[PDB]
Design a protein around this ligand. Sequence first.
Ligand SMILES: [Zn+2]
Ligand SMILES: [Zn+2]
Ligand SMILES: [Zn+2]
Ligand SMILES: [Zn+2]
Lengths: 48, 1114, 216, 46, 67
Amino acid sequence: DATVPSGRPETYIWRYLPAPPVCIRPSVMMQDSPASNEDDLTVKLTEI
Amino acid sequence: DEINTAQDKWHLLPAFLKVKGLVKQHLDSFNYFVDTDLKKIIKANQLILSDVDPEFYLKYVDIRVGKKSSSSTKDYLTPPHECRLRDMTYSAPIYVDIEYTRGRNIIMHKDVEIGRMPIMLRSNKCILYDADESKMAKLNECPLDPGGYFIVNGTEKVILVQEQLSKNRIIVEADEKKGIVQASVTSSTHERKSKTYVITKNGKIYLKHNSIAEEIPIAIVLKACGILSDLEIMQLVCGNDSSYQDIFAVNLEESSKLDIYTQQQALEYIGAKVKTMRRQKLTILQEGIEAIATTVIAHLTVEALDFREKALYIAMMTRRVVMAMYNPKMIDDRDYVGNKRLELAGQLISLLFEDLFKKFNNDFKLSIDKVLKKPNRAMEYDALLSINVHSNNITSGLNRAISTGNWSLKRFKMERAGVTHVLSRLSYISALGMMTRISSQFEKSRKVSGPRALQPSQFGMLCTADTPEGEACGLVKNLALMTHITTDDEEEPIKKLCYVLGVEDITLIDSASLHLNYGVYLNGTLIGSIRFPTKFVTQFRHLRRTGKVSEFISIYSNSHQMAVHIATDGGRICRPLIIVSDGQSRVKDIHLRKLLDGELDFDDFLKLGLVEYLDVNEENDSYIALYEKDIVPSMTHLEIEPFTILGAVAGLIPYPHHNQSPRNTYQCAMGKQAIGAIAYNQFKRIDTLLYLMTYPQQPMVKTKTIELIDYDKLPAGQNATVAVMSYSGYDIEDALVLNKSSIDRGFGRCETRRKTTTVLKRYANHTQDIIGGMRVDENGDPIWQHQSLGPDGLGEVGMKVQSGQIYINKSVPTNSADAPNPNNVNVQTQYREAPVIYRGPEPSHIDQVMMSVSDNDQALIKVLLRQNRRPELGDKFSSRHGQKGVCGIIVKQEDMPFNDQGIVPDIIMNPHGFPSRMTVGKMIELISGKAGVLNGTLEYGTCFGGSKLEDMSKILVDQGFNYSGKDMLYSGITGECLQAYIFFGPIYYQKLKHMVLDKMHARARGPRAVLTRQPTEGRSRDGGLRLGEMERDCVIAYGASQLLLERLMISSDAFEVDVCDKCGLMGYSGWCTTCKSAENIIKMTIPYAAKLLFQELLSMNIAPRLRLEDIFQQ
Amino acid sequence: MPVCKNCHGTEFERDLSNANNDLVCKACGVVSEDNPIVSEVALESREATLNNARRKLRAVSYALHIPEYITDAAFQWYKLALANNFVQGRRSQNVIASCLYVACRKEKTHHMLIDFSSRLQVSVYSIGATFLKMVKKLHITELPLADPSLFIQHFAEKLDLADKKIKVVKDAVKLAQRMSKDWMFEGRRPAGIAGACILLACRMNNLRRTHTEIVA
Amino acid sequence: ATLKYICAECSSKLSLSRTDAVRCKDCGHRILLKARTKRLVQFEAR
Amino acid sequence: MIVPVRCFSCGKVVGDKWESYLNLLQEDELDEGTALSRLGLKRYCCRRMILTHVDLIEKFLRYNPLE
Ligand SMILES: [Zn+2]
Ligand SMILES: [Zn+2]
Ligand SMILES: [Zn+2]
Ligand SMILES: [Zn+2]
């Protein structure tokens, strides 16, 4: 449906990839010394 | 006293088990490893030279563990139990010797450590080996410990004996559709490889072999394997006449449409469909291009040089699948034990060792080079002493392996997981319960119907009394009391012997084979097809029992299929038993008096040719008796004892032959969860969670299989005077009812033991974490939240601690973890004190607190706490016999049934368990109990045997009790006579794990996971519980709305979200942030998981944009 | 660190008893955190060289049987000496050598420069030279002054013999101590006078152990 | 017996300094205990 | 461990009747029961303990810190 808000079949290919909030990406506890366990997606997009 | 031929058979097994211990399986294979294979592994690679300086070499010669050529055993080692406290690893070092090359005309050598092997307790090389009852004390360790379990990083674990499918043999699977795949998966050292072979369509049968590309017609390959006449192929793979004429004829047919005369075409047509040569050494692209692969793909089974052997092999493998295509059945099922071979700890180590070693070289060729790049003067300087630099890839790599249990094997390109398991000491039985446990594996998915149930071929060679619920990927089994697991023997000698006895080599065998006799197979390979099957066998078996080819290398006839297999493969299940030759048995009763007199023992019979290990297949080809009362001149073997059928744990069940099976299976499952004496070192040892009982007692009735495993010197249980009567109402369904003024008299009182280890470890800041403490406010007493500690700032001995107290005070440095610099004027000081607290439902005590230091030199503190649980309401008790239950009301004393001698039955059980469980073996155990105690002899009863019931009564009646247990009782709550009798005598109740005071668990509002925010899982963490997708439906069916919304919403995650009516999306406080507003937004509430889905969605590109409407005005 | 929004209290107790895990102050009663949310479960020139330094570091590390501790202790020292570019052009061993050395020196353990070289064909001078140079290009404290009283421990380990050596230990220790006191200890290579003390106390304990066996 | 604690094997009472060593004095054996307190302690029997 | 000092049911003093038992069996080679019955345990609640109950405490006392 073309309601003129979603701009028609353009968006469906990635252009601006939104980064999910850190609350979706909880930084794992420091767990004993400054080495602080990652979480995997943040590693992914931080590679992107 | 003439020794009684019927009974005295029994005196075999202990001498058998006295000489050859209960667990050889982990012991002997580990010995055969540390002695033989280690010598062989380097004998495989003794030479490493990288490519440069053509004059260099490093030659391995000798391998030893713990002998540097000083003393007989090691000149120095660490006591194992002491090693169990420090969290160390119990190890003996590896020693090697290398003739090598350094300088001019030199070729020096030495004795060198390459690292440390973690030797196994009570092995050849352990300190414990042959130490007597006193040296045992000086080493501060149990005499009765089964042993055979490694110990690393302070825990022990085990190599769990791991069952494996038959490898390098033939298997044939039929099926609907398909056309009956055959497989032989065959591996020797280099390259495990599978070859599957199957029809594609309509009699047209191909090799699917992932080595090659795909689907070669069997007639082609069969040509290229050297049989070219093609119209004698029918005589070979098909048969003489039969119906196999047309059935096979189709593949022979269209072999014609393509090629012929393999010397070019078929040999080539193979090499046309091969994969690439991987570049170099492609030069042999030829007509003999693939002749390598024909000779060697997976068939390192046969391989060799001329083509006839392999040819007729693949032929006789093709025969069986077309036989299956003629009719189903007539196919080997992957199920029964005969086709399953198990592999002990020795080999499972070796396959890991020679890997880590092969790596050790593969990198050592590298570290030998960075010397040799740069011609620095004349370079020799041995290059050796870098090996220590380069070591512990063999040690630490091996430790980490055996502790974690993930075996990485790139050499076979196959990585197993979950091999070891922590040896579980809840009791003495479990200590050997992780021993004698066979881990089943492979066999694809969980539900698959083929490899699951328990087959009758399993008699006596695997425990029939338990195959519990522990599935996961694969089913778990147990060995018997008597299993001698076949080791490897040898190959060539038995071969050329088989020629000596009159077979004829496959070459001279012409055409018709399947006609003549049966055939003969060696490890699944055809050799001679000897004339006269019978005399051949009987001759041969007569040799196996006397002068040559001993233990395994068994032999058996097969009728349906024509062949006689001879298998020497190791890692295979066996069992002893007695020969009845011609008319009757070979014992003749004189050897038994010649035995327990003390000079005969066992392995002496085998030389005498009396008893011999059998093989699954072989006993199939035998005829076996049970009791000597049955011998027929037609017979062959008689079992030495029937009750050896039940496994180790199963021995605890008295009279297992009076129950049904499920009560034994539940028993053999739970009994290892009882509580008991553990081992004599019980108090000196500190283990993570260790139960134990106050006043244990022998089980009144002993099954003879107890005395073998010494369960009576470490009894787990109480021996409790019980009465079967329905009482109060609290009894009812499985629920026991105990007795005060009885439990208070020290029934079943448990001691529990735990520990919390805290390793004080220094930081790269040159900074130490400190144990100081003891604040002591307001003149002379330590504050309560602390208190209870001591001057040392560490927990002290014997003082009640509960909840907020501190039983070890551990302060850590704050700035230490930061990056130190060459600047400190004064302070390393500031500390963050993070004491660990004892959070528990009940006060407890600190008894033994250890200070030590591990190998890397860092402070290590291990304290152990004990609390003695009174058998409080809601505790699991079990009846040795398959019962289970939990105490109901605890009656005081005066109540409960009493009687003539006023004894007040301690546990008062329930009748209704018996009929629908249908277990009468217990209700015999009772009578045996009341019987025994009155005479004073522990009265035996045992599987398929024991004290007969009918002569019991005559022990009672004369002593004044009913010929059954049933005896009057005066109900104590009234004092009249119980209008029906009651039946009681001492049974043996062993209090279990699953104390309630552990398990009772509750929460108001506890922690939340940062991620989801729902209640966090389990006890420990905190609490909170689970409404599953399955359960939630329930409250739907009732139609309870406000409850459900009160549950999955308010009670769990109650959360506010600010959504913008226009372009619905979530926003914080005021703003929408997609359209700056702080105006059109409306607050409302919503499950936090639901928001978390609106983001984890909306991150991914999608947006459920929320519409809205007001609630009111329709 | 926060304050009670009512009593203005400066001190908090967490309450772990009833599995609420409250956080409340003695003078207020008002909570602060309920619901204690608590968690669970490339290519660069310099960083690559740091990884290599880790590898050559670990390698020589356990070879001398040094703490897993002290290595990552000294790895930082390497990272520091990289900043002044002292480590650029000198033979890598001589750098990782002393960088690993001063650490176990400061911890006051038994490891020794003469002992430290024989991992290589090199001279216990080149290493010593580079060492004493990175003492200039950095600025380092006094602490690493070793005595034989430390080395006699590990030297005693390979002496074979039996429990008596521990006795010999105390026999040697107070010996060497007085030897330091008697004033003929100074300005000498410590490992030698240590071995001398061991020969003495050993002979004092009446055993036969040859000089070769000692200097090994 | 009297003072702070004991070895395992040596069984000789050892009073330890602050931040000194985990060695015992007499033997070369390493691990040790903390000997039982002299302070009164109350149990109930039941 | 050590012989309990009463029954778990009947409540008769026991722990004494252990040492005199085991002494009575060692010396004077004699059966199990007839020892007990003349030692004064006519009930069976009473009797099992002296008859049952391995005595471990010695097999523990092998290992002790003091030595
Ligand atoms: Zn909006
Ligand atoms: Zn406040
Ligand atoms: Zn000591
Ligand atoms: Zn009694």
